[PDB]
Amino acid sequence: TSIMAVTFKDGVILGADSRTTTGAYIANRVTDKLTRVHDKIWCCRSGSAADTQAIADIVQYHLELYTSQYGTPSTETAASVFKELCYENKDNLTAGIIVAGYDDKNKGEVYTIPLGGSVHKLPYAIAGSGSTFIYGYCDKNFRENMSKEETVDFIKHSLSQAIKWDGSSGGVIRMVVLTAAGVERLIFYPDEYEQL
Amino acid sequence: TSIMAVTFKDGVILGADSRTTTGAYIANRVTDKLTRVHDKIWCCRSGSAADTQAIADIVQYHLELYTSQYGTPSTETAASVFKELCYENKDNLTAGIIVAGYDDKNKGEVYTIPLGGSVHKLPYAIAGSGSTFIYGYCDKNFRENMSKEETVDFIKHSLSQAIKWDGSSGGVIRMVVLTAAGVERLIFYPDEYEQL
Amino acid sequence: TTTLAFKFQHGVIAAVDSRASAGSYISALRMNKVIEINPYLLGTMSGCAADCQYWERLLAKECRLYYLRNGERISVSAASKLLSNMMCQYRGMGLSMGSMICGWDKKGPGLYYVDEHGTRLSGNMFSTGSGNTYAYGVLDSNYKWDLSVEDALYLGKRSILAAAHRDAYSGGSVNLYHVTEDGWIYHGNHDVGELFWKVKEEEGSFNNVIG
Amino acid sequence: QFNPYGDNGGTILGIAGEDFAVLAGDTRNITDYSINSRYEPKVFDCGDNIVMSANGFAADGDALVKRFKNSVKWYHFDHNDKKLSINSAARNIQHLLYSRRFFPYYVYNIIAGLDEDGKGAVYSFDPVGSYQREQCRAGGAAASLIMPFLDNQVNFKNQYEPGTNGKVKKPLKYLSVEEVIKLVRDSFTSATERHIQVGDGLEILIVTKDGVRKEFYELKRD
Amino acid sequence: TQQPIVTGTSVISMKYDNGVIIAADNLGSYGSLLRFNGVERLIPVGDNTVVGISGDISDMQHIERLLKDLVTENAYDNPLADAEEALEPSYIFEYLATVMYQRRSKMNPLWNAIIVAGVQSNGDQFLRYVNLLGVTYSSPTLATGFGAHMANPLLRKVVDRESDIPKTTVQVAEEAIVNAMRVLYYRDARSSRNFSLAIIDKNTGLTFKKNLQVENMKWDFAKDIKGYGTQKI
Amino acid sequence: MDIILGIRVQDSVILASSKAVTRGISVLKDSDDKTRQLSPHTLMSFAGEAGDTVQFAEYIQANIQLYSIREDYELSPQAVSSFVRQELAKSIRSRRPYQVNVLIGGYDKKKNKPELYQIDYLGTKVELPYGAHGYSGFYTFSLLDHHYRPDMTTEEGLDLLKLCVQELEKRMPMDFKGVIVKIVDKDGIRQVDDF
Amino acid sequence: MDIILGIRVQDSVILASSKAVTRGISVLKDSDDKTRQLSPHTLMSFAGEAGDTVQFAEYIQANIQLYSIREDYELSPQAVSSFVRQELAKSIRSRRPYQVNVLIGGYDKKKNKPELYQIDYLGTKVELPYGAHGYSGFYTFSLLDHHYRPDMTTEEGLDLLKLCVQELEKRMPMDFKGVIVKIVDKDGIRQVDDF
Amino acid sequence: TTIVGVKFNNGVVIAADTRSTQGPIVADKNCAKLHRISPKIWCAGAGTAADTEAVTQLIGSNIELHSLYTSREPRVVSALQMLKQHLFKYQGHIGAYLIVAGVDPTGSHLFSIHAHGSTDVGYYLSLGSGSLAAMAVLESHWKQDLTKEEAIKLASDAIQAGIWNDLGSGSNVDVCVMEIGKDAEYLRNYLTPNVREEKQKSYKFPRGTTAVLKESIVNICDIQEE
Amino acid sequence: SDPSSINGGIVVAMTGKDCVAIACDLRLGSQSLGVSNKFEKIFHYGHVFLGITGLATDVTTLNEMFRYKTNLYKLKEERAIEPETFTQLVSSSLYERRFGPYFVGPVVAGINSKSGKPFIAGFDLIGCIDEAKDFIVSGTASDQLFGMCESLYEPNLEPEDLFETISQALLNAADRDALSGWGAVVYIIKKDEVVKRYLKMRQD
Ligand SMILES: *[C@@](C)(CO)[C@](*)(O)[C@H](Cc1ccccc1)NC(=O)[C@H](Cc1ccc(OC)cc1)NC(=O)[C@@H](C)NC(=O)CN1CCOCC1
Ligand SMILES: *[C@@](C)(CO)[C@](*)(O)[C@H](Cc1ccccc1)NC(=O)[C@H](Cc1ccc(OC)cc1)NC(=O)[C@@H](C)NC(=O)CN1CCOCC1
Ligand SMILES: [Mg+2]
Ligand SMILES: [Mg+2]
Ligand SMILES: [Mg+2]
Ligand SMILES: [Mg+2]
Ligand SMILES: [Mg+2]
């Protein structure tokens, strides 16, 4: 898996590959790893698909109930619900989740929640097996307050390299753009990103 | 460990960090991982320091004896001696070696010899625990027939990122330039490469 | 440890050593491996010292409550069974306790062997611990029902000595008890070092040992 | 896998006099080959003229002492400020230890004080609750080094009276507090030489009818 | 029972004449990966206590929240919450030590090593250590992990025993701490150059220094070192 | 414990059970009676893990005695054996099963027939003319297969039983210290004091 | 195999060795002689792992017999015991050690003295007035410690030996099928045919 | 153990503590860990004590024979090469961890050596259980262009750090200084900061205290004449 | 299972004024079972004394081996071997079995016949020499012996005073060890006379 979330001037963009493996067999080559827990709060999932689906479903339930009572929740609040689940059930879970969301007050925010259940707020985050191969690239090429088009290129180039070197990553590159304008889904096929 | 060898217009440059660890303790922070097996045939060592030192010493002996009888050996010949040792003793060795050398006929050549004892001739090679973090960066930034100054910057930037993310890598960046002009040793300290 | 106890014409003898070990290290030279539950009830101890002390002192609580409720001393049979039932609760939990419940009741003198498995055996003679085999050798060849109190006390004393000598994990001293229908009678602490040399000379035994 | 136990080293020593008692322990706290503290008190005045030391795994030792101190406090509340006798404290501690028969307090405990006849008393425990009153006891890391010395110098074992040649033993004459403290200091100085976990400092608590008194002595810090 | 995932390395500290100093680097390691570079592992509790934590970061964040809630709870129905009945270093420590020992007794520990540094109401210096086993000890110098092996020897050259504390100034103590942090950066493979330092003084109060860097490093001699034995070039 | 044998003849059931009890390397007792009377015409012998055997037997005994008092009526050997089997089948899937094998020898006063039931610790019940547990059957069943008739007298049953014990005493490496023999018939239960 | 005993009296050495041989759960033989005559005045009994015992004993026997023929002279019991010990000490660090414990009973014709040597499979030699291997000593040494004198007659030695066997037969869980007793004295080696 | 090696202006110095341990027990309070390979080549060993000795005596023997064969003074690189090839051959089973230092016609040298056969070069090194305590001192106080007196001070300070802070190290400090153009000076017990204090009591017994059974003269002399 | 503690036993050696002492218990066992109370663990080759603890078969084997080697030494050198030289011989002989060692704890004691200097030395099972000035201990009660020797010992003791010190060190250490005791022997060694004393002790 290769997943990342990047903040930029107008908000935040989540990115992911689409490969799901059972050993060396590709069980699904068009997976959607970008999952919605609220209107403008999305997460990227890594680790056990069963665990991360079960968590994201519970989180979506909590934020739906939160909204009914207290109005639109913050991205920090969503990350706290993820954390609480990932931390208290760390012995029985294998989940590496990146949470990304857009407020009008706080704008684009990114939280990463690795295996232990710790939370880390960041300008951008990378995770999954393929992330190891792009730590150097992403660190060198990331800038704060990039444009939408710059941020899309950054994620596309980054995940392109992750896919190139990681066998557990591949397929299409899916992206979700979170801004005041709304929610935009993007997709990029191999013939586009492989020639970068 | 973070090691790499890069061919360029005038020849080849070997690069390495200087950190040697025993678990989390840094046993040596000024290690010289760039080792000479012949006048203009050098290698970068990764894995068991005992194994790689023992191998490089045996190889140096073979190439000294080769030279006495048949004249200056090729870089391919040096890589073959490494391979023969690494392959036939693969059950009792943990050695990941990059071989780099300069001929006037063949110019700069780079061979990598990973764990199994296979040989791979490449334009450039990266190895060691810290190499994982710069696969994306090195792939994106490498060009053939670079200048000496470009190649030095490429290695410096690459190993800077490897050191930044890999705890097993660090210290100074050592480099060895192999050209027709001769053999030039370079060194770059933390205050220089950390701010890149 | 080595412990023994046997019934005879004039009641029951109970003899134990006093050594305690923690590996090859002798942690104690003089430990009491007999518990005075009541004036007519004794309990020997072999195995884990903590288990032996806790459960037999808890047995004494339960035997005391029996007397208060019924206005009558508990039998040796009933006391031994209460203990064996305690062992059966912590069945397989890792307790190590080998004990002989000695006493005098209406049926006369009583002797029961009880271990951590919940085993409960009635008999005229028992010996427990690492050195029980050495004690049995002397007991079996010299035991009679027609023993005098003096000779019976010596037999239990000499049988422990045999074990203390050969068994590395038995020794220190010998504690003697004699149970009668008027209660138990303590017949003192006997250092094995001194007792050995004394028995060697008087009896002529242990010829192989030089002194 | 998580190991809930540890070894903080240290060594303790209890000696009972005719009308006094001492409980000594080194002040060094360690893990593996590192020193945590050169002065970490290990012997405590628990009240009612009783002193206590739980040697082995410090966390379990601190928990036990803390619980016993608590037990003394509640003994006063429940029984009209009655003084807890040393024999009653010993029995109470047995039940504190055995409450954990299947997840033991990993400590060798010693208490010292005076019995109800005013004589010196020392009680010794094992991790699971077996106890006994003794005249002399060393516990902990260097216990095997020290105990034989005390058998020889306190109970005069293997010592006979000259001229008789093994026929008459050395008579068991009582020891003064000054003589005992010498044996305590020499015991710990010897243990410090040959045991790596023993050193830094020695703290002695002396119990008499007048109360509890402390004495501190430096030990080698290597 | 668990295993630590994202970890923080050494926390070092020492007493000086008027207070205590505590320091810890800003790194959150993920095995050999130096994953997170902006992690604060010194957590102030009021203006008289700083809790320094090493080990598992998720458990650290949990403890950080317990302490934040402890301050909240202490203020409840407490007119003297910012005065006589304010939280003391000894209260905060004993609370943590209680929690750590309870968790290890349930075989579900908080995988941490904690040093509580502070100054009490009466001006006394407080410095005590507690870890995942519930083991507690106090000393003029305290350090966790690698700091125990490398920092303590250096800090004990300044304050070797209790009587050296009144002779040690804040400048000397801070200098010793900063030197120790440099040594750890040379020799601890799971350390970072960036660190935080906190001073709790009985007169000047709590001084919290962020974004400190290890400086004045010696590397030049590396140029002369060649090969691993016989190599000259 | 080790050897328990059973044989059903014309008008009675005979149970033979070893006398030895061993702890560690020492034989503690050579006169142990490995049996309990469940009712006047029903006897149960037992063998298995130390402690469990007696506890199980006495628990069964108490339950059958309770039934007898409640109904003022003796349960048939078949009914008792089924009750025992269910308890063992219940036990095998418990947290800590009772490791006990039993033989139930009874005389059914209604049908005027002796009955022998063999039940192992799993709750495996079988009605047999002769039975054994553990290794006992390996040595003895060939003799029983050869010599057994259903019209045998009690005396002939005892003689065939002696031959089985003699074979055990010859070919077993194990000294089981002889056997206590008990006979169950219309008149109740009695022990053969000389064997 | 299991039990081998030895006792040195005034003018002779007496060796008692069990007769049982067991394969699996069956006693194959109850008359096995666990001994070999090494020389006219030297007898060696043995006990240990199956097969190794006889192979080792016969190998020793062949070597001592070879020595006797070569020199036309009988080696002293002490010399034989040392030779045997060295072979076992040599064996314990081999690829597959010989798992054999032995007692060597001999009468030294030069010194006119009986001699008993106990040697275990590690090559641990001790000269003793009485000895045993395995668990045998646990039951018998207390009796021997009590009753043994160095001036005992051969008949008194046999009576004390009977008492040892009786204790073994009472307290061992193991049926070893009695013992073959042999006496070694100045006149050579003879077997006690009634024991 | 704690052992160090420090280079200086005109040579090299090595130092060691003097404690040897059988687990938590101190077997020898004044052990000699500074071994001689050749007159001006000294090594210091940590790990399995018998291995450090045996391997040092073996290489020292072969070095002496080599020196005789070549009519030359032995070089540190020769000892280094012979040691590592020997240790490598036994794949870490010979638990010898050494700091090798010396002076020869080529100059002054300082190497470390691990049990598996890996070698390192340095201006300052430390090995053993107290290596971290010693290295903390070396990293704090070492500098380029040290004098002989500064290097001995630094070396012994590094050993002291191990003595006081490492339980595996203790007692005294041994030093050996190898300077170019000079005889090597072995300073046995250079520091003695752990002398046992006077005991409070004398435990000398009265003659006749011990019980005796038999007395006999032991013949240690050979068979006599006449 | 542990070869160094199957048979049990202890050896202790001490230096005095112009004298040395070496002592050992007499027990030989099979774990808990006491087998022999006459198993002496001290041997001498000329005027050099060797005490060996540990696995009894190796004790016996090594004695026979060093008897072999010292007898050849003497035939070739035309003189008896000295303690310092013998100590190196023991060390060499043990290390030649580095990867299949004798499970022993040897102790050398003696006086150099030329210099008159008292000498003691101890080894681990594979040859590491411990040349102590004061005392050497070996065996299953080595911890106990260290405690006794370290407290009872004082330098420059006379032969008859040294006897009492070493005897009490051994006796009281043995009485706190299950696998040691069953008798004891003490050798008092001077430049040209050696006295051997069997001690009276508890036999349990
Ligand atoms: C013999 C000595 C050994 O088999 C005998 O069984 C004694 C029986 C006994 C009974 C009551 C009191 C004292 C002794 N047993 C012991 O000494 C046991 C043996 C044993 C060791 C280890 C075990 O764990 C598997 C089980 C049994 N020793 C102990 O219980 C020992 C751990 N405890 C003590 O030594 C406690 N003492 C030490 C001195 O201070 C007072 C407490
Ligand atoms: C410090 C003590 C620890 O590193 C130092 O390295 C010393 C080095 C040393 C060098 C020369 C002389 C004296 C000391 N090492 C020791 O003191 C070692 C500690 C040690 C014990 C066991 C080992 O095996 C894993 C390795 C090291 N002492 C000894 O080696 C000596 C006391 N021998 C033994 O303890 C017996 N060893 C023999 C080999 O098998 C294991 C037990
Ligand atoms: Mg799951
Ligand atoms: Mg791919
Ligand atoms: Mg130290
Ligand atoms: Mg069945
Ligand atoms: Mg004994």
Q: What is the DSSP letter of H205?
A: P
| Contact of A165 with A133, CB cutoff 8 Å | yes
The enclosing H or E element of B4 equals strand B3-8
Ligand 1 contacts CB of residue C129 (under 6 A): yes
Q: How far apart, in Å, are the Cα atoms of F144 and each of E140, F12, F194?
A: 85, 16, 22
Contacts of B54 in chain H (CB under 8 A): 84-85, 88, 117
Q: Are G132 and G5 in contact (CB under 8 A)?
A: yes
The CATH number of the domain where F77 resides is what? 3.60.20.10
- Calculate how far, in angstroms, residue C170's C-alpha sits from the geometric centre of ligand 7: 4
CB A28 within 8 A of CB A124: no
Task: Locate D75 and state its tokens.
Answer: 């003994």
Which parts of chain D fold into alpha helices (H)?
58-78, 86-98, 143-153, 177-194
3-state secondary structure C164-191: HHHECCCCCEEEEEEEECCEEEEEEEEE
Taking the Cβ of residue H223 and every Cβ of chain C, the question of whether any pair is shorter than 8 Å is answered with no
What is the separation of C-alpha E19 from the centre of its chain, rounded to a whole number of angstroms?
A: 15
Question: CA angle, corner I23, sides to I19 and I29, nearest 5?
Answer: 170
Within 10 Å of residue I71's Cβ, how many Cβ atoms? Answer: 13
DSSP chain G: ---EEEEE-SSEEEEEEE--EEETTEEEES----EEEEETTEEEEEEESTTHHHHHHHHHHHHHHHHHHHHTSPPPHHHHHHHHHHHHHHHHTSSS---EEEEEEEEETTTTEEEEEEE-TT--EEE-SEEE-TTHHHHHHHHHHHH--TT--HHHHHHHHHHHHHHHHHH-SB----EEEEEEETTEEEEES--
Cα–Cα distance, G127 to G8 (Å, whole number): 10
Nearest CA owner, ligand 1 atom 38: C27
Quote the CA–CA distance of H146 and E213 in Å, as a whole number. 28
Q: Is I153 helix (H, G, I), strand (E, B) or coil?
A: coil
Q: Which residue of B has its CA nearest to A196?
A: B140
Nearest Cα residue to D25 out of D36, D15, D35 = D15
C1 tagged catalytic? yes
The distance of Cα E2 from the centroid of its chain, to the nearest Å, equals 23
Protein residue with least CA distance to atom 16, ligand 1: C20
The total number of structural domains in chain H stands at 1
Q: What angle do CA C14, C17, C19 make, to 5 degrees?
A: 155
Residue I15 and residue I107 in contact, taking contact as beta carbons nearer than 8 Å: no
From the list D16, D86, D35, the residue with the least C-alpha distance to D201 is: D35
Q: Contact, A56 vs A35, CB < 8 A? A: yes
> Which chain G residues are Cβ-neighbours of C196 within 8 angstroms?
none
Residues 6+ away with beta carbon under 8 Å from E91: none
Q: Which residues of E touch A114 (CB under 8 A)?
A: 5-6, 30, 35
CA distance C38 to C73: 9
CB within 8 Å: B49 and H118: yes
Nearest residue to H44 via CA among H105, H111, H99: H99
Q: What is the Cα–Cα distance from A41 to D146, expressed in whole angstroms?
A: 69
Closest to B140 measured CA to CA, from C67, D180, A139, E21: A139
Q: Are A96 and A47 in contact (CB under 8 A)?
A: yes
Query: For ligand 2, is residue H45 a contact (CB within 6 Å)?
Result: yes
Method: X-ray
Structure tokens at B136: 């994306």
d(CA H213, CA H209) in angstroms, rounded, equals 13
> What's the rounded Cα separation, in Å, for the pair I189 and H220?
10
Task: Give the CATH number of the domain where residue H100 resides.
Answer: 3.60.20.10
**Contacts with I103 (C-beta within 8 Å, 6 or more apart), sequence order:** I3, I4, I54, I55, I58, I125
Phi then psi dihedrals of residue D70, to 5 deg: -65, -40
Residue with tokens 């929640």: A113
Element (H, E) at D113: strand D107-114
Q: Are G7 and G129 in contact, with CB atoms under 8 Å apart?
A: yes
Which CB contacts under 8 angstroms, 24+ apart, belong to F68-75? F68/F39, F74/F39, F74/F40, F74/F41, F74/F42, F74/F109, F75/F39, F75/F42
**What's the CA gap between E214 and E197, in Å, rounded?**
12
Cβ(A118)–Cβ(A111) below 8 Å: no
Question: Mind spelling out the 3-state secondary structure of chain A?
Answer: CCEEEEEECCEEEEEECCCEEECCEEEECCCCCEEEEECCEEEEEEECHHHHHHHHHHHHHHHHHHHHHHCCCCHHHHHHHHHHHHHHCCCCCCEEEEEEEECCCCCEEEEEECCCCCCEEECEEEECHHHHHHHHHHHHHCCCCCCHHHHHHHHHHHHHHHHHHCCCCCCCEEEEEEECCCEEEEEECHHHHCCC
Q: Between the CA of residue B92 and those of A186, B122, D39, H91, what are the distances in Å?
A: 50, 26, 49, 9
Alpha-carbon distances, residue F102 vs F84, F91, F132, F184, H45 (angstroms) = 9, 14, 9, 16, 69
User: What's the CA gap between E131 and E146, in Å, rounded?
Assistant: 14
Dihedral sign computed on CA atoms, order G147, G134, I173, D122: negative
Ligand 2 atom at shortest distance from the alpha carbon of H23: 21
Eight-state DSSP code of residue H166: B
The domain total for chain I is 1
Distances (CA, A) of B177 to B5, B130, F39: 10, 21, 101
Q: F-side interface with G, Cβ within 8 Å? A: 20, 22, 25-27, 30, 135, 138, 169-175
Which H or E run includes C147?
none
Residue G97: Cβ-neighbour burial (10 angstroms; 0-12, 13-18, 19+): middle
CB burial of residue F117 (10 Å; 0-12, 13-18, 19+): buried
| C-alpha closest to that of C60 among F55, F51, D91, D110 | D91
Say whether residue H128 is in contact with chain D using an 8 A CB cutoff.
no
Does residue G176 contact residue G2 with C-beta atoms inside 8 Å?
yes
Task: Report angle CA I141, I143, I146 to the nearest 5 degrees.
Answer: 110
Check: CB of residue C69 under 8 Å from CB of residue C42: no
Asked if D4 reaches chain E (Cβ–Cβ under 8 Å), the answer is: yes
The torsion region of residue C194 among left (phi > 0), alpha (psi -120 to 50) and beta comes to alpha
Q: Half-sphere exposure (CA, 13 Å, Cβ side) for E83?
A: 3
Q: Are the CB atoms for F91 and F124 separated by under 8 Å? A: no
Count of beta carbons in the 10 Å neighbourhood of residue A92: 8
Phi, psi torsion values for H31, nearest 5 degrees? -80, 150
- Partners of D9 in beta bridges: none
Nearest C-alpha in C relative to G160: C141
CA dist., res. D52 & res. D68, Å (int): 9
Report the domain count for chain D.
1
Q: Name the residue among I43, I47, I55, I49 with its Cα closest to residue I14.
A: I49
C-alpha span between H36 and H28 (Å, rounded): 20
Q: Does ligand 1 come within 6 angstroms of the Cβ of C96?
A: yes
Structural tokens at position D76: 């006063």
Domain of I121, CATH number, reads: 3.60.20.10
Asked whether the beta carbons of residue H208 and residue D163 sit closer than 8 angstroms, the reply is: yes
Nearest CA to ligand 1 atom 4: C1
Residue H187: how many CB atoms within 10 A of its CB? 16
Q: What angle, 0 to 180 degrees and rounded to 10, lies between the N-to-C axes of helices E57-75 and E89-105? A: 130
Return the axis-axis angle of helices H76-89 and H49-70, rounded to nearest 10°. Answer: 130
| Contact call for residues I83 and I119 (beta carbons, < 8 A) | yes
Cα-to-centroid distance, G98 and ligand 5 (Å): 48
Please give the DSSP secondary-structure letter assigned to residue B123: S
Structure tokens at F96: 């800590």
Residue F161: CB atoms within 10 Å? 25
CB distance from F52 to chain C under 8 Å?
A: yes
Beta strands in chain I (DSSP E): 10-15, 20-25, 28-30, 33-36, 42-45, 48-54, 104-111, 118-123, 129-130, 135-139, 184-190, 193-199
d(CA H120, CA H100): 10
H98 three-class SS? strand
From edge to edge, which strands make up the β-sheet containing A34-38?
Answer: A34-38, A41-47, A95-102, A108-113, A120-122
Evaluated on CA atoms G33, G37, G42, G46, the torsion sign reads negative
Top-level CATH class of E1-233? alpha beta
Residues of chain G found within 8 Å of residue I99, distances taken between Cβ atoms: none
Residue I63 CA to residue I117 CA, distance in Å, equals 24
Q: Closest Cα to residue F38, out of F103, F113, F90, F133?
A: F103
Contact partners, residue A149, CB within 8 Å, separation at least 6: none
* Cα C18 to chain centroid, rounded: 11
* CB within 8 Å: E228 and B171: no
Q: From ligand 1's centre to the CA of C22, what distance in Å? A: 7
Q: Please report, in angstroms and rounded to a whole number, the separation of the first and last CA atoms in chain E.
A: 52
Q: How many CB atoms are located within 10 Å of the residue D81 CB?
A: 8
Which residue, among H169, H191, H200, would best test binding to D if mutated, counting the most D CBs under 10 Å from its CB? H200
Q: Which atom in ligand 2 lies closest to the alpha carbon of residue H45?
A: 10
Residue F98 C-alpha from the chain's centroid: 17
DSSP E strand boundaries for chain F: 4-8, 12-18, 21-23, 26-29, 35-39, 42-48, 100-108, 113-119, 125-127, 130-132, 179-185, 188-192
Residue of A5, A2, A6 lying closest to A18 (CA atoms): A2
Helix, strand or coil for residue H202? coil
Question: Of B44, B55, B178, which is closest to residue B109 (Cα–Cα)?
Answer: B178
- Evaluate whether chains G and C are touching (3 or more beta carbon pairs less than 8 Å apart): yes
End-to-end CA distance of chain A: 20
The total of structural domains in chain F comes to 1
Say if ligand 2 is within 6 A of residue H62 CB.
no
List D54's β-bridge partners, or say none: D109
Q: What's CA I106's distance to the chain center, in Å?
A: 6
H47 Cβ closer than 6 Å to some ligand 2 atom: yes
**Which of D142, D148, D194 lies nearest to residue I173, judging by beta carbons?**
D148
Give the CATH class of A1-196: alpha beta
Residue H48 beta carbon below 6 angstroms from any ligand 2 atom: yes
Distance in Å, alpha carbon of G193 to nearest chain I alpha carbon: 30
- For residue H203, the chain I residues in CB contact (below 8 A) are 151-152, 154, 165
Q: Ligand 6 centre from F85 Cα, in Å?
A: 10
Domain that holds residue D188: 1-222
CA distance readout (Å), H210 to D170, D215, G85, I171, I174: 11, 35, 37, 9, 14
Least Cα distance to B10 among B149, B169, B193, B162 occurs for: B149
- Ligand 7 centre to CA of F18 (Å) is 35
- Does residue B146 contact residue B153 with C-beta atoms inside 8 Å? no
SS3 F100: strand
Contacts of B37 (CB under 8 A, 6+ apart): B43, B56, B59, B60, B63, B78, B99
Report the alpha-carbon distance of residue C79 to residue F109 in Å, rounded. 38
Are chains D and G touching, using the cut-off of 8 Å on CB pairs and a minimum of 3 such pairs? no
Q: For atom 19 of ligand 2, which residue has the closest CA?
A: H21
**Contact predicate F9/F100, CB 8 Å:** no
Cβ-based burial of C124 (10 A; exposed 0-12, middle 13-18, buried ≥19): middle
Residue given tokens 């050695």 in the structure block: B95
Ligand 3: distance of its center to the CA of A50 in Å?
Answer: 6
Host domain of residue C174: 1-211
CA distance E200 to E124: 11
* Residues in A 165-184 with any Cβ partner in B closer than 8 A: 165
Give phi and psi for B48, each to the nearest 5. -65, 120
